[PDB]
Amino acid sequence: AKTASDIPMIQLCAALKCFVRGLMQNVETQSLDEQVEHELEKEDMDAFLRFCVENLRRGFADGMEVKCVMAATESLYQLGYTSTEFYEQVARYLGSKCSSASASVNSSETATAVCLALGEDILDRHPDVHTFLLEVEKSGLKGEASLSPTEWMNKNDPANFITPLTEIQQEGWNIINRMVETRAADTEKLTALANEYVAILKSTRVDDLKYFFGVFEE
């Protein structure tokens, strides 16, 4: 919560998905004294969630992709932010971009989850959003909820240089940094290096190809 200024929205969604997966399991409560502890943890969680929803509102104002706000709203529902005054803003922004946003390029399970999380009165207040959610739950990506948070972040934000490179991924950058300073006329050397590079393409990150093409123009 501290030092979280100028936060790209994908970072916030990854953090929220990380937090939801480390929650304690509910057990029968001894009502003598632990109810007070429950109130204290409720107050602290509210003190955190208020800052989170403030940042989400700033993102709303500045414009953001429907997938990220979708996932963030689902995650905040997972944490019990049951206020319904922010969910109307959620529905308003989602219906604002409902015309052109792609339907089958989203997670269907997330669609079902957010449709459940959004109130039925809020739903039939926005029949277009209702229909869009049903369409996404019919045709959409499957199994995206089971991925680890770092996998989700890597598969929705290319590059981003946060997680360290694997051992295999370092070989591609060795090849590229070796190709950079090679003389242009040495065609055989470049051919050999590229034929070595293409062998490990399946493991290299997709974004780094931007460099592989660029040196080709160089």
Would you give the distance in Å from CA 83 to the centre of its chain? 23
Report in angstroms the alpha-carbon separations of 50 from 64, 83, 116: 20, 11, 22
In residues, how long is the chain?
218
Q: Report 110-169 residues binding other proteins (CB under 8 A).
A: 157-162
Closest approach of other proteins to the CB of residue 21, in Å: 22
Q: Which stretch binds other proteins (CB under 8 A): 8-16, 77-85, 186-194, 197-205?
A: 8-16
Gap between the Cα atoms of 19 and 60, Å rounded:
22
Residue closer to other proteins by CB (options 43, 121) is 43
Among 134, 180, 192, 206, binds other proteins (CB under 8 A): 180
User: Which pair of structure tokens corresponds to residue 3?
Assistant: 């030092």
Exposed, middle or buried: residue 107 (CB in 10 Å: 0-12, 13-18, 19+)?
buried
Contact track, other proteins, 47-86, x by CB under 8 A: x---x-----------------------------------
Write phi, then psi, for 170 (nearest 5 degrees).
Answer: -70, -30
**Cβ closest to other proteins, residue 47 vs residue 116:** 47
Contact between 109 and 85 under an 8 Å Cβ cutoff? The reply is no
**99 vs 213, beta carbon nearer other proteins:** 213
Q: Which is nearer to other proteins, 65 or 124 (CB)?
A: 65
Site string for other proteins, 9-48 (x = CB under 8 A): -xx---------------------x-xx--xx------x-
* Contacting residue, 84, 150, 177, 182, with other proteins by CB under 8 A: 177
Q: Is the CB of residue 65 less than 8 Å from the CB of residue 6?
A: no
Shortest spacing between CB 46 and other proteins, in angstroms: 11
SS (H, E, C) 18-71: HHHCCCCCCCCCCCCCHHHHHHHHHHHHHHHHHHHHHHHHHHHHHCCCHHHHHH
- What does the binding site for other proteins look like in residue numbers (CB under 8 A)? 1-8, 10-11, 33, 35-36, 39-40, 47, 51, 157-162, 176-177, 179-180, 210-211, 214-215, 217-218
